[PDB]
Amino acid sequence: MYSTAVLLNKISPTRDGQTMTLADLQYLSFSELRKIFDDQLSWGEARHLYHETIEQKKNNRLLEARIFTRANPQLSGAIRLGIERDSVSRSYDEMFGARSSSFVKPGSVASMFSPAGYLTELYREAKDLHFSSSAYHLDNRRPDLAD
Amino acid sequence: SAQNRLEKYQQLYDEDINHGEQRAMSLLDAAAGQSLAGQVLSIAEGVADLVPNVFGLACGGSRWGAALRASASVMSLSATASQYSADKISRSEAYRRR
Amino acid sequence: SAQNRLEKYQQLYDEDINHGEQRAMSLLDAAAGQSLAGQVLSIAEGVADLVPNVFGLACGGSRWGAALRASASVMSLSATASQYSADKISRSEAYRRR
Amino acid sequence: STWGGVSRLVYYPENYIDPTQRIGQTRMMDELLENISQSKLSRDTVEDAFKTYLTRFETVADLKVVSAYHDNVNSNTGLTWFVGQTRENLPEYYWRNVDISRMQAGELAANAWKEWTKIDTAVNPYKDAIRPVIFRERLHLIWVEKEEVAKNGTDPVETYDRFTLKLAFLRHDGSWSAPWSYDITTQVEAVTDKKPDTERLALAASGFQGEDTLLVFVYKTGKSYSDFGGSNKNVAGMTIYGDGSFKKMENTALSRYSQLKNTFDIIHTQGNDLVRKASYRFAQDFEVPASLNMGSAIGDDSLTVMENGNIPQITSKYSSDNLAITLHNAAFTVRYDGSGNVI
Amino acid sequence: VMAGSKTHTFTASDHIASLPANSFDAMPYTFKPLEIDASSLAFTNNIAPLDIVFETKAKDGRVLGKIKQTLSVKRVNYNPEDILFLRETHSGAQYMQLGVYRIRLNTLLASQLVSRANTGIDTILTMETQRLPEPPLGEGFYATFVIPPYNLSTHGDERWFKLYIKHVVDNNSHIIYSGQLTDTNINITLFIPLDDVPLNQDYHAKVYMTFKKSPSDGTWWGPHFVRDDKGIVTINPKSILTHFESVNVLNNYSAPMDFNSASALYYWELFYYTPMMCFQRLLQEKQFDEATQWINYVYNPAGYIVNGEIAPWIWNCRPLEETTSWNANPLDAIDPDAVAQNDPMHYKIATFMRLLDQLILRGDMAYRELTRDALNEAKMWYVRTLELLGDEPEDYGSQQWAAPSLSGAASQTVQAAYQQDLTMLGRGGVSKNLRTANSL
Amino acid sequence: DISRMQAGELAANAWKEWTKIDTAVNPYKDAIRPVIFRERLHLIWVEKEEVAKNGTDPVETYDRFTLKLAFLRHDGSWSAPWSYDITTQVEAVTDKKP
Amino acid sequence: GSAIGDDSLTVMENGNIPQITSKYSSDNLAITLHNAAFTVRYDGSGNVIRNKQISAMKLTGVDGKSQYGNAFIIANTVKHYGGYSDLGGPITVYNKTKNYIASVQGHLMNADYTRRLILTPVENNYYARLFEFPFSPNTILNTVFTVGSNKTSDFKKCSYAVDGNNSQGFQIFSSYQSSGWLDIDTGINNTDIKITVMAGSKTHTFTASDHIASLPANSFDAMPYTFKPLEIDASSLAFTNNIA
Amino acid sequence: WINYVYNPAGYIVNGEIAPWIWNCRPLEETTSWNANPLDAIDPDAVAQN
């Protein structure tokens, strides 16, 4: 019942002279979104923005998974007869170079399911659990973790 | 003696399920099917009994509660069929473990 | 030989309950539920059959003892459901002991 | 391990696809599953099980939708509930629902629908006067039945048709409760002019949420309808409350719901084709929720807290071209308390 | 309370029912009925919001608590063109109509299954059966449009286009198609509805196309279909077709069965899930030949014999062959089946893995006999499986990875840039900064 | 399968074993026959009942004739039968002397 | 039913006559066929042809889209011959009506290396090449090159399509042997799409030039043809055992 | 299932952490609903007091 463009215009500019985009709010919880834009967004607007962000994130994940699946070298392959190259696959390959063909074996640190990815997710989500002033902040008790 | 024991057990394992057990399981399956086969007939009897059956100058005779009795009957039949199927599956699993 | 025996028994213990036993227990539970589900229909049939069903110049036709028969039916259904649930629980306990 | 498995599920679902079980499996598929669950199997056994499954599929897929109801005041949102009837000569009925709000650019995703579910409560409707409704925010089935009864104490014994309105509701565990019964013979005879065989009697039901009641209308199918009440003898009304009691509507009350005539079945002007229109939830001019639960909030520095914020009554009034909203008993409590700390 | 452009503030100084006791414990405040003049609400899609906020602060300026909410006010709309209704054609097809859109409700496959069931069940599970036509959805016709490839000069920057209909039921316009312009021609087949008595005598229906450079309607700027006394929809000669490449009408075409309709679940169960379940059950009991026979209804590397010749298709399951998606929200819950339903390629991979499992089990069973002939049979099974699989690949990107710092890998800017690029790719297609400059 | 006839002798394998019908048929005399429309087997018969007209001071009876049609389903079961009233046609063609 | 065209290039599908009616008036039997329809689609039923050549002919040219109804030169049997690795292989097709060369490939080794299509009759001597086309973007596949002159003989005598040929030696990334040569025309005439019916001694031919309900869109994709009702005078059927 | 009664991490309501500690209201407010718990040996009665 709202329009995402209008709400984004209300939030914009994003401190950088740019229009706010759904990607920039990936990123933060609903409570944070309501707190930061408390002066400009009501309850329904914040709820709609949160739902739209979640939907966009899910769609991006699905698109990436599909692109990776259709480009697996393992299926080359008597099943390759039932594989078709789409326009989206060509666009992704053109934009990101040879990333889509850069598969790695399991057990390597570069894999997205390797413990490196788990550690990155943990650090990304847990970095802001305490204020920078508090002595319990992760970057204060163990400064070396960032390096 | 050990060789004799090995031959006996190998023969038993190779034989696996003989014919009598197959017949018993098929009978249980057929019983489940036959028990399930009566629900449509029960519903038909219930719907048919609602029509009045006396005429003249004293009419009536309809059985008001036919449909509810038919529904109860079909649900009981479903319960019986489920019980039979459970028995058959349990017997099969016991044979596999043996 | 001892290592082979250990591997076999470890695999059997890890597998625990296969799918057929789960299906049998679920079927017994469903049978108990279906058996229990008929009490409301039996009561409704009993209360409906009491209304007179003949008219004209010779009225009546009510079945006087409908309610008591309905009560007997619902109690029999409860007994059957209890039996089914007891069977299911006994089978589960036997599997645990095994 | 758990995070790895959950993350991998999206990219490689084939590692977790089990042919013998799946969320949303239909009942007949399970019936086939136990039909082929014995230890040893033959080609004939599997073929017979597949034939039984085919019988079930043929029974289910031959359904035809007979009634529908939309749970809203407009077509933009809400859920639509359908009741359908089998092809065979049996009183077997099924129901389902769809989410029409998922429509975009004409086509609906297949997951917005719901599988057919059987109704087993001994329904014997007269012709096709059976329909779903949502009153007290749970599903209800409402239908009519016809019996042949003679008046007692008359020397020439004459018979007539008695029409009974039956209403039932769906319980929590999927069972159906015993149905309430009412006598509507006079209304049917009035609106049909004692020719029920030649005229198509039609039934409509709506749920007035504002007053928490159910409105039932019985009418004669036609090309168009005038305003209710007064001289219009083609429509009769009925009101059902929460406890099951009823009340026959009068002309003054009948004229209040004249706007619902747009959701009635009609005979198409171009070609005598019957068209059925799904009923709608009723409202006067605008719909507003009856109550609003504010919730609770935490004050600054975790010192105070507001609780029990609630607006139990919200009313609306549309006079001329002005809409006014009245809030009754807007209340909330303030208490000095911290939500867990040394403070 | 905020209602559209009006803001009303009610303070407890004059609207309080009873001021509570002045104590550190719970103090409940209750208000007399409050009146709001909501005559300035902006109704979009027959629904408008209404905002309510409870505010309380002490003399120090501290906020004792703030509660926000949004109320929904719905406009009652019983207009004849906004009330969905059900109709049934003479062919037996039931369709539910809302405004201009129509949806099929029932199915007619059960009647036609008898011919296949009279012979063996092998006749039922065939691509020919799954390609059966369906009766038309009410009164209307079919049309084919060719959309030209994207060019910057005429289409303009963003590659998005829409197709709207007009002069059906009402005289407004409703969107009937939306899509993205690409570098090749696009073939679109659509079902144009048609009412019994047209509103405009000259043109019975109008279809037009909009993009960035031309986001308007215009006059005679699109195909204007007119129906004669006996079928035969024709295009009005005085209709500009510059935007389209070619627009044709199909006067007798009958669409095949749809695997994305209301009855999609039953079709998928009959044609895909059931043979797979039967094959799995047969395989679990070491009945290999019957399992192969049952799985051959879905996939068979040797092809399928139809009328005595090899069929041109590869997969016997039509939804798998055409990759028809029938799920729009697969990530609402943890469910591999839902994800596979969204993209049915995973079903292809699952079937392939099941076939490989059966072959390897056959090979192991033959190997365990130790007879020379059994050894040869096991060798044949293993060789066949290896030939089916192909040659396994090696690691490629392991040595191309530059190890980043933990702070760098978790940087929000990198994730935001990647998500922005993915969104632009999926929703648009603009290729600004074509090379990604892999050093970033 | 009569197409297998060769110079007058039919091979014994061209026939099919008798199969029972269990759907509660009560035909009048010998007016029961099979048929095939919609390309599946159907059984069609007639039944006779004795019914009196209501609301007549001298209560007179007559014979009501009902035509019933049923069809065979996939798994070998028989569906519920459609019913029609053909009393007028029977009385017309027989001149009320059945 | 369905059928496969010559050289596994095209395929007819969905052939169906849904309505057939009969009328016996006096001593004349007439048969009417309603909505005789079938679809024709360019597709190969499993080979290198469908994977590469058909997709090559579906690409858009530089003179503006289309590429349908043109004359093409293709190879009978093409097989991987050698190189550093076996990629999808540069599969090339010649368009005579516009003098175009369309090349397709499966994958690429690495984006940093310069890549260009090279056609030589010897596959070993770089200086013996007859065709050289640089990829305008390096990381792109399935492009056209617009020779610009009638060089059909040169293309015919040039086997060994090479997808490498850098300037630091040769560096043959991939190479494919073409073997035979075929010439095809994808254009069609409305008088060659016919239905012929034999009834006893009578033969009736109905062409799409006059019995077509609506001519479909001229495209490489599926093209459905539908026919108006067809009348057959079957008064000369030879009835043996009451069936003809 | 046990999180419906006690959860050390708190309970999310409307997108924010709820102020209460125990999700069971009688436990949170310590409501006593038994006046004679020592009439017989019964741990449940004592706990109810």
Author numbering:
A (entry chain D): 1 to 147
B (entry chain A), C (entry chain E): 2104 to 2201
D (entry chain D): 1028 to 1370
E (entry chain D): 1518 to 1957
F (entry chain E): 1126 to 1223
G (entry chain E): 1322 to 1565
H (entry chain C): 1811 to 1859
Paper text:
ABC toxin complexes (Tcs) are a class of α-pore forming toxins (αPFTs) that consist of three subunits capable of assembling into a single protein apparatus with the ability to shuttle and translocate toxic peptides into target cells. The two TcAs termed Xn-XptA1 and Xn-XptA2 are the targeting components of each complex and display variations in insect specificity. The TcAs are the largest subunits of the complex and contain a translocation channel with hydrophobic loops at the end allowing for membrane permeation. Upon TcA binding and an environmental pH change, the complex undergoes a conformational change into an active state in which the translocation channel is exposed and pierces the target cell membrane.
The second strategy we implemented to alter the host tropism of Xn-XptA2 was to substitute a full RBD from the homologous TcA Photorhabdus luminescens TcdA1 (Pl-TcdA1) into Xn-XptA2. Regarding the domain substitution, we decided to substitute the Xn-XptA2 RBD C (F1659-G1787) for the analogous RBD D (A1643-N1752) in Pl-TcdA1 due to these RBDs being closest to the membrane before pore formation. This was achieved by excising the sequence of DNA encoding the TcdA1 RBD D and ligating this sequence into the scaffold sequence encoding for Xn-XptA2 after excision of the homologous RBD C sequence. Structural analysis displayed a stable chimera in the State 1 conformation, indicating that the full RBD substitution did not have an allosteric effect on alternative domains. Upon further inspection, the Pl-TcdA1 RBD D within the Xn-XptA2 scaffold was mostly identical in structure to Pl-TcdA1 wt RBD D, with all β-sheets being conserved and the loss of one α-helix at position N1651-G1656. When the Panc1 and MiaPaCa2 cells were exposed to the Xn-XptA2 RBD C chimera Tc, we observed no significant difference in cell viability for both cell lines. Due to the structural integrity of Pl-TcdA1 RBD D within the Xn-XptA2 RBD C chimera, we conclude that RBD C is not responsible for host tropism to Panc1 and MiaPaCa2 cells through the process of elimination. Furthermore, we display the capability to substitute alternative RBDs into the Xn-XptA2 scaffold while maintaining structural stability.
